[PDB]
């Protein structure tokens, strides 16, 4: 608490025992900061979010709530028919490693 200057935390849950062969523990400052921000931990020391997966190849800037200027900043400059991207009702093609999150996912990732 003196290290991370976090004093007003009511609960801090741990484990009954470690499962690895090393039994190396985690710093308690990380646990305090997790308890302060209301996030949990996994078996390997990461915070994860599970969701059902669905496919998509083309999108519209109005469905995902992003301006055309922001898209042009990201790299999208045309629509799927070769025309320049100047409207929010045009259909754009998704790049292979671009994802669209839910709003629960965004709330937790905040």
């Amino acid at each position: 608490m003196e290290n991370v200057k976090v004093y007003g935390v009511d609960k801090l849950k741990g484990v009954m025992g470690m499962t690895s062969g090393w039994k190396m523990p985690e710093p308690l400052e990380k646990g305090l900061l997790r308890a302060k921000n209301d996030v949990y931990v996994f078996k390997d020391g990461t915070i994860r979010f599970d969701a059902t997966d669905a496919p998509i190849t083309h999108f519209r800037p109005r469905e995902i709530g992003v301006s055309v200027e922001k898209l042009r900043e990201l790299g999208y400059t045309h629509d799927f028919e070769g025309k320049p991207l100047v409207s929010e009702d045009q259909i754009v093609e998704l790049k292979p490693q671009d994802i669209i999150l839910s709003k629960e996912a965004g709330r937790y990732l905040l």
Binding site: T57, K95, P96, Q97
Partner: protein
Amino acid sequence: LDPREVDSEVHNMDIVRYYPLEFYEATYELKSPKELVGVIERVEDRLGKPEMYYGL
């Protein structure tokens, strides 16, 4: 990302804007989908060429 080494079930997905008339005329004959693999373009028909990430 390299589509050549991701999976094998995604290599059967269609990348056509519309199906041809021959597909509809062959559905009435209760054919098997393997008989018209070349008629409708799939993902497997583009592997190797640079246009795997381009024109779906």
